[PDB]
Each structure stands twice: as structure tokens, then as C-alpha cells.
């Protein structure tokens, strides 16, 4: 949830001020190089268990 907070504050530059649609755009960010993105990848690797 802290990673999702970081991701939506990062993705605020593409919404105007909206916050409820921030979750899907935060989940669909794909950098090869971002220092929180891979931790969120393995976080969502955990939640399938």
C-alpha cells in the first residue's frame, strides 16, 4: 500500500487532480528501471498465493 501510494503520487502528473482512477494507472506503469516498480511486482507475486 505504501508502494501504491508512491506510485499514484508519481502518476499524479497524468491525471488532473483525480485520485480514484489513480490505482489502475499506478498498476499499469511499466518501467524497466524504477526503484519501486519491481518491489510492487514481487508484492503482487505474493498476493496470488
Amino acid at each position: 500500500q505504501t508502494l501504491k501510494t508512491v506510485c499514484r503520487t508519481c502518476s499524479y502528473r497524468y491525471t488532473s487532480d483525480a485520485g480514484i482512477e489513480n490505482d489502475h494507472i499506478a498498476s499499469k506503469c511499466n518501467s524497466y528501471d524504477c526503484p519501486v516498480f519491481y518491489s510492487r511486482v514481487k508484492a503482487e507475486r505474493y498476493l496470488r498465493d
Binding site: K4, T9, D17, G19, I20, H24, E44
Partner: protein
């Protein structure tokens, strides 16, 4: 002192004229809710990216829901000098100068005043000035329109709020705000009166969560010393026991912060919670719910954690008694007293809106009291991370803020106490804002005799 002399004066109650090896049992509590329904908010036993599909599910479900009411429950098109109020939601034909019912959802300003890998503060520069401006944008997923008027700040329809707006059009961009719409009332679940041999029924919504860090004794104080005995030994001579019913905590079972906690300090506060609950369980039966800072999914549909809140002395009671003296219930629950349906919220669902994510919609108890009035009225997406499940989040039966309306909603953990009652066209709803326990408690009786609430200052 003369305080002792007051005890010397009051020799009339030698023993309160109780046998005192006779327990006078008070309540004939019905609790129709417990067994013969599935709880919608509860987990799936087979179950035991997510948010995206849920947002369109809320939007479409409300879209057919309020699609039934733009002329059935609101303005006739014969008025407005025959300005067409036909059910066009898209902004392509909103530009037609006759004002239609603009069935859309406001997502104008929702971001965070308090907080760096993603560089948030640089982005948050755009948040502060634009969010501070209170201007309202309406989105039916087809386009934004401007909103001005008096109800911009007085009526707090902050986010996820499907409304139909009525104003003299006068520009394609903007309206004034004369009227809003609502979902239809899912109908009156019958409030009973047991008129023949009236029980003088129990009246309780007491605990907002005994917020209990190990780090402070003052939160440990005002539990187990004034409470567990107001329910039974501290006496209003003797009517307090007659009013009190079955114990209701709402969230906040143990306060802690997740990044500083480990195994044994979690069991220290959970076994002292077990001490409290096994102390009060002979006196008053209890209904328990986790969900904001006690262990949870941190979602509104949240699986309540059995077998962890209790020591071995208390662990075997839920095995022995299935749901009667205690059962694990979720952050929302429909407690129904043969049709006195009441809803609970642990508070986080409205407290994040009230303090954490609010730059706008502000003209502070009398402001924040009406935010959960709004969240009751639209039955909508309050929080920022809703329903938060890897499997079976919402299967088109169980909205986290549901569609069947209660007679009282419980929300918790506010700064001050707030208790009003408002009547709507569907039913009557009493507003319950029980404060967080370190903010002076203000602990409350609820309902069910003449639908009346009574707080008492625990500090």
C-alpha cells in the same frame, strides 16, 4: 474529605436491594442477523488489478440504478419552459442549451495534503494550488463540465458521487447547482415495536475501538478501570445496566503501527484485549470487528481475524459458542434487531476523506459529521484503496458501502462526538460519530427504545 461523607450520607443503598447471588439478566436480545443470512461483506470460504474492474462495476451499477430516476423521482420536462431533461449523459449533447439531467460522477479534487523514489513533492506542487480551489468537475466518463454555486462547498459530494445536476445552462462549460440526484431507496426494512410486554430493549454502540499501544498507559487507562464495570459494577443505581445491551466495538481493537511491530508485542496487546473481553464476556456479550489499524486486509470488505485476539482461556469460547456470545464480523455489518438494521464503519473509510485526502470541498466536527451523511446517501466509493482482494472482490452482490439501507450507520474515530438524526424519503437514519478513545472517548448508547442515543464522557 467530604467525598467520603457523601458515601456516609448515602446509606440508603445498603446492597441496592439485589439478592447479589441472583443475576438479573438484562436483555432479551433477538439478533436475527447472526445465523440466517450470508453476510455480503464477509469473505468467501472457497476463496479462503482488482480495483480497476470494480470502479466500472460501481459506475455501471449506479448507472442503471439512478437511470430509473431522472423523471420518475425528479423534475418533469413540462417545466423549465419545456427545456429537455432527457437522459443524455454524454457531453456531446450536453452542449445543447436545454439543461438535461447530467448523470455523472465528480472526481474534481482528491489528493493528499500530507506526504521519494517517485518524486512526490514536485508533483504535489500541482496538488496544492489547484486542489485548494474548490471547483467541481462532473464525469460520466464522457467529459468534464464546470460547476459553480452554493452547494459546491455546503454539500460535500467529494468523490464517486453519481448525481444529476439541474441548473440554468447558460454556457456549455458550466451550470449552477440547484438540484442533485440520488439512488433509489431500497425499501423500508420494517422497524418493529414489541408493544406487548415491551422489553425496555438494550441500547448500545459503546466502543469505538480500544486503541491500545503498549507504548502508552493512558490509553490502557479508561479501559478495564472505568469500563468492564460501568457494564456491571459501576452503577447509575441501577438503570445503566437496564439500558446497556450487547457490547459493540467498531474497529481499532489494538492500536499499533505496522513498521514497528513484531510477534510478541502483538500478542501482548492482543492478550490484554483477551483479558478485557474475557473479563466483560460473563457480564455483557460482545460483537467484535477489526479493520483500520488492528490486523486486517486494510479494506472495507475485510476478513475478521478469529483465534488471534484471544488467549487459550478465551479461545475455546468461540468453539463452544458459535456466534452467540462473540463472533467475528467485518468492518460493515448489518446488525438487525428483527428489522432494526444498523450499519457499522470503523472510521478509516470516512477519516481518510475527512483529513487525509481533502484539498477541496471546504467552506471541525459539524463539517466532518456530514461527510458520512453524504457517504450514506450515495452508497459510494469513499476510500482510496477499496476492496483490495486477490480473489472474489465484488461478484455483483456485495458493495463495500452497500445498497440496502440501515436505520443507523455507525462510523468511528472522530475528534468530537456527533449525534444527529435525519429523516429521508426512504427511512429515518441517525448519525453516529463515536470518537477515538484517546480523544476523550464520548462513549455512546445507541437505539431501540424510541431510537435515541446517549453519550457519556469517559474522561
Amino acid at each position: 474529605h467530604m467525598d467520603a461523607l457523601l458515601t456516609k450520607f448515602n446509606e440508603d443503598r445498603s446492597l441496592q436491594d439485589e439478592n447479589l447471588s441472583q443475576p438479573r439478566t438484562r436483555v432479551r436480545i433477538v439478533d436475527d442477523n447472526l445465523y440466517n443470512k450470508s453476510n455480503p461483506f464477509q469473505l468467501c470460504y472457497k476463496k479462503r488489478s482488482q480495483y480497476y474492474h470494480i470502479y466500472q462495476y460501481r459506475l455501471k451499477t449506479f448507472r442503471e440504478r439512478v437511470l430509473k430516476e431522472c423523471d420518475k423521482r425528479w423534475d418533469a420536462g413540462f417545466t423549465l419552459n419545456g427545456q429537455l431533461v432527457l437522459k443524455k449523459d454524454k457531453v456531446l449533447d450536453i452542449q445543447g442549451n436545454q439543461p438535461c439531467w447530467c448523470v455523472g460522477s465528480i472526481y474534481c479534487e482528491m489528493k493528499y495534503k500530507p506526504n521519494t523514489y517517485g518524486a512526490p513533492d514536485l508533483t504535489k506542487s500541482y496538488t496544492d494550488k489547484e486542489g485548494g480551489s474548490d471547483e467541481i468537475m462532473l464525469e460520466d466518463e464522457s467529459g468534464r463540465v464546470l460547476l459553480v454555486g452554493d452547494f459546491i462547498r455546503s454539500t460535500p459530494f467529494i468523490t464517486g458521487v453519481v448525481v444529476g445536476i439541474l441548473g440554468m445552462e447558460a454556457e456549455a462549460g458550466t451550470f449552477q447547482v440547484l438540484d442533485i440526484c440520488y439512488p433509489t431507496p431500497l425499501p423500508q426494512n420494517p422497524f418493529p415495536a414489541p408493544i406487548a410486554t415491551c422489553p425496555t430493549r438494550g441500547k448500545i454502540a459503546l466502543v469505538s475501538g480500544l486503541n491500545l499501544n503498549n507504548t502508552s498507559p493512558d490509553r490502557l487507562l479508561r479501559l478495564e478501570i472505568l469500563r468492564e464495570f460501568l457494564m456491571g459494577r459501576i452503577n447509575n443505581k441501577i438503570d445503566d445496566i437496564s439500558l446497556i445491551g450487547r457490547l459493540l466495538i467498531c474497529g481499532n481493537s489494538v492500536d499499533f503501527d505496522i513498521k514497528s511491530v513484531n510477534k510478541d508485542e502483538l500478542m501482548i496487546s492482543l492478550t490484554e484485549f483477551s483479558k478485557f473481553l474475557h473479563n466483560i464476556l460473563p457480564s455483557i456479550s460482545v460483537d467484535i470487528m477489526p479493520g483500520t489499524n488492528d490486523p486486517s486486509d486494510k479494506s472495507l470488505p475485510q476478513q475478521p481475524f478469529h483465534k488471534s485476539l484471544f488467549d487459550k482461556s478465551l479461545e475455546s469460547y468461540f468453539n463452544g459458542s458459535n456466534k452467540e456470545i462473540l463472533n467475528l464480523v467485518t468492518n460493515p455489518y448489518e446488525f438487525s434487531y428483527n428489522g432494526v438494521d444498523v450499519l457499522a464503519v470503523s472510521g478509516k473509510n470516512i477519516n481518510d476523506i475527512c483529513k487525509y485526502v481533502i484539498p477541496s470541498n471546504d467552506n471541525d466536527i459539524e463539517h466532518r459529521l456530514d461527510l458520512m451523511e453524504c457517504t450514506m446517501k450515495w452508497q459510494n466509493i469513499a476510500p482510496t484503496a477499496p476492496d483490495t482482494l486477490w480473489c472474489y472482490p465484488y461478484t455483483d452482490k456485495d458493495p463495500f458501502v452497500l445498497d440496502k439501507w440501515p436505520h443507523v450507520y455507525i462510523v468511528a474515530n472522530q475528534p468530537y462526538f456527533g449525534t444527529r438524526v435525519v429523516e429521508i424519503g426512504g427511512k429515518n437514519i441517525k448519525i453516529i460519530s463515536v470518537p477515538e478513545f484517546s480523544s476523550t472517548g464520548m462513549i455512546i448508547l445507541l437505539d431501540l427504545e424510541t431510537l435515541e442515543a446517549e453519550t457519556v464522557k469517559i474522561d
